[PDB]
Amino acid sequence: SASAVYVLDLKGKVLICRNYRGDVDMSEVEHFMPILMEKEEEGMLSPILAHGGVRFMWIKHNNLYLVATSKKNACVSLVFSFLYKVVQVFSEYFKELEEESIRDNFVIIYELLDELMDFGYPQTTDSKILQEYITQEAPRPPATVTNAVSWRSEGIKYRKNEVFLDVIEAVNLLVSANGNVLRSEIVGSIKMRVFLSGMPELRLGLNDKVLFDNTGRGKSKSVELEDVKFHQCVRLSRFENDRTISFIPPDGEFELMSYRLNTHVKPLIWIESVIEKHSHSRIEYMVKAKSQFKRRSTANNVEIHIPVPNDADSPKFKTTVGSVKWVPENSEIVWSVKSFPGGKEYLMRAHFGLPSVEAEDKEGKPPISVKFEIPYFTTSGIQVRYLKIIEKSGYQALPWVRYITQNGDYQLRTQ
Amino acid sequence: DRKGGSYSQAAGSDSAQS
Amino acid sequence: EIFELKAELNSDKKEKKKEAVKKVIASMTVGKDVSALFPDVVNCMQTDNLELKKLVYLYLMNYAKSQPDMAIMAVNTFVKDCEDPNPLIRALAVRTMGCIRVDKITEYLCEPLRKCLKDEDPYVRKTAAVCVAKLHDINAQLVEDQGFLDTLKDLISDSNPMVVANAVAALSEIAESH
Amino acid sequence: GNIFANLFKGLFGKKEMRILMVGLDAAGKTTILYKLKLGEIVTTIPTIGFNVETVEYKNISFTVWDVGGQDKIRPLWRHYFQNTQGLIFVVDSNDRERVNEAREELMRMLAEDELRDAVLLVFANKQDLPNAMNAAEITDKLGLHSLRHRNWYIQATCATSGDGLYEGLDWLSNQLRNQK
Amino acid sequence: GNIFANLFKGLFGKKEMRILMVGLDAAGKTTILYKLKLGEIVTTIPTIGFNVETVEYKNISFTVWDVGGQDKIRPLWRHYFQNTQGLIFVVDSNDRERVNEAREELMRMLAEDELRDAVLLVFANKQDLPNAMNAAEITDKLGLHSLRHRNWYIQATCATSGDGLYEGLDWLSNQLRNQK
């Protein structure tokens, strides 16, 4: 129940404001900047502010914080969802999120803001559907918004029917400084770029453990996805009944399902690092990386971030494979490896100086983060079984899908 | 080709499950 | 500046009228109190181009409480726009009518709201459902007298699931303050 | 400078002109405007705001701005006095009690120094009932001959029939245009 | 003679074929025909007469003649047996008492010597309730294997969903067309 959604700037200037209910005066935005400064300077800064009887709940974007005023006990989750939808719509319409487009695309921005939410209740949020009613360069609204199918515009015709899938894996490992991994979860990401003619009803079928058990094939490699988050086009009832993944794919790239299950296997990369930091004299980095992944897979663009001293200077790197560069902006040693064959072992011996005078305050121990991304590797073992592309007219589809394995929250706790 | 794994064609359904 | 803008807005050329409307919108968005020119933009209201109509409606909504007396010259335009064949124009007019924070203007808008309550267009139905809730929030007594509760109750039992959801949300908001 | 383009435009017709539509509420103003623009008796609710339209006749685009006769809208006619070239007043002979009010309003509107180039245009509206007077009794009652430096023309038009509209348009064109 | 035109027509597709739509009343025949032609579940009143439509798929114009299951219209199916090339029967597994009547009607229609080239086409209609049987229990009850010199194919289609319609169309095309 937001009262007025406004877009601010980095200097406190409101780039654009659009009141929806008017229950909050527009002058209350002036106290938002001082309130945010006080909260940040006292550690009380939060995404949801409070200017007396009016709360300013908003998030910070690339260049501005979208503050949406509210007065009643409105759904903060609803406000956050509306803000996320607005950010996605702006990103779809404008390739960049900065003040350069706010002051240049106001004509279409105002129309989009007026059409998106009325009286604090959003009604239309599909960027592809919204692009047919509001343009920056007006006919009747499309029937898709009024119709039940608001994610598949009718009348789409293409020369070919090719759908590109992307099974993106995120290897997140929370390894403590003692050497034990605490948070080791892998979240699947099935992003598909459907480009066909018409409104096909996709019939997704994979090697799920639950599906195999129900059908009686619970003996082969089946993915035990703890959480499966279907998209809007996917029918929740069909999945709830017999794990039937039936949905109408949209035109473009979108996320259909997002698997998320815990991981109990060995890490793909094992890093053994040592810290021979002398007391204001020198420092040693005996870092050894062991690739526990399969030898048939190669981790393209391996970036193991090793946090070096903040005041360290005159560093020397004695490694084996991969480019080692120290970034003063990040204050860490970037163990950059182009191609890392599975089972490879890289040994590094760091040596950097340190000032004699001790630092005034402690800087902490940032964790070591690996940026390995090995494509064509399905760690979870989940394989797509079939994709029932059915169209009323009748056509032969050519679906495609690729599996990409990367490291997510794969950080290693420092000692 | 494409970085991150070459795209592979997908099936239509579980032919072995009827 | 102000005189030049007024002269441009009082011209018969649509090319200069669009530029003047854009400049007025930018000045208000740039932080310029353009409420003194609200009566001047009132004359350039009934326009065939939808691009200028949206800007005029936004300026009137943002310049409604500041000059309620000068807003008495828009009821006829809203009534005329409430019957446009294009569903988008009708929806925009309904949204602007409910966004106008005028006590003496909501009284004359009861008839257009009643006409648009049974609109066949789902977008028009949603716009009417939002406008009824806005009028009830602005004036509960006027909404109760207009008897829009019965129409809202039957809205949930009609087609257009988006319109049904909008009507349910409006009814929940009305009952929340009830 | 060169005025070849202006001469070429005038060879086939370039002048458009303007017009105003004022009068009391329920005086046939909206119906008269609908008949002039469309050609049918369109039934409309009282003009809460105003109506703006244009008439294309004799190669002149006669833009008409209908103004209601509401009490709160009577003093709002000064907004249309800016950038206005014509003025047409529609009389209501079927309202004996409102005749004095209409005459007073016409005198008040004609007592403005900014509205001086707008010639008088008296329209005999409601020319369908036996109680309507002639084209001189109404003028004599209103004293249209006492308007110094004012070019007034009395024309009677029947809302149901539409007779005399062509004559009024021709008279307005002859007053506005001083060419062949 | 020359058959160059026929070969040219066949190079891009010339065969169209025909089809029939028979079954008991309220058996999903009209809804099935609407889904095949349009692709939506259209609600229609009981078929007092008959429905004739065509389906364009795989370069073959599958003309479908829907026939109701009325008692007075059951003996009227002999009119459609003339100049008929296909025959599709829609079963009603949700009517246990009407299953025997449907089987008797199918036997009576299949006991005609003129309707011999029309292959059997069993459609498992009403595939949305738990009371519906499998694709073999209905066939076993109807004894479709006892039809000598009859090419029958059992296909289950859900009226609400529409699954299996493509498979049935492909099977019908493969039975009618004996080419690549």
Ligand SMILES: Nc1nc2c(ncn2[C@@H]2O[C@H](COP(=O)(O)OP(=O)(O)OP(=O)(O)O)[C@@H](O)[C@H]2O)c(=O)[nH]1
């Ligand atoms: N039947 C009939 N009615 C007429 C005639 N002339 C004028 N009227 C009355 O005049 C009214 C015309 O109103 P509109 O056409 O809406 O325009 P208006 O005269 O400006 O009235 P307002 O909108 O209230 O200012 C009608 O309601 C009629 O009752 C006529 O010749 N015949």
Ligand SMILES: Nc1nc2c(ncn2[C@@H]2O[C@H](COP(=O)(O)OP(=O)(O)OP(=O)(O)O)[C@@H](O)[C@H]2O)c(=O)[nH]1
């Ligand atoms: N809800 C639902 N009803 C079905 C389904 N399949 C068949 N029906 C019933 O079957 C009837 C179909 O009737 P029609 O579409 O008009 O055509 P028909 O089957 O030939 O019926 P008649 O016209 O009487 O001969 C509907 O009225 C439904 O009640 C289904 O899958 N879901």
Ligand SMILES: [Mg+2]
């Ligand atoms: Mg009128």
Ligand SMILES: [Mg+2]
């Ligand atoms: Mg039927």
